Ligand binder design. Sequence first.
Ligand SMILES: [Cl-]
Length: 95
Amino acid sequence: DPEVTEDGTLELFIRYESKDYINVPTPKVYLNDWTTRERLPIKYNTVQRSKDQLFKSTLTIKDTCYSSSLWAKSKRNAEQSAAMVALEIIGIKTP
Ligand SMILES: [Cl-]
């Protein structure tokens, strides 16, 4: 049951842990493979905020937006966490 923001973005509080994906495909890879098979448009729109220099990414798949509600220490972490939100909400099986 994701949180829904005012503009309709679907969010979950997710931190990306790179240690869980050492030498294996990352969440962005799984999500990209799925959107490629479905021919779905996918884009990441990432921002860094001035107050603490953390990052947040809004991933759009077709006309649906997903993002992590946890601001991340890096651009990569914000994008990977947003991909994990999309994977978990859509229900895409990952290892
Ligand atoms: Cl982080």
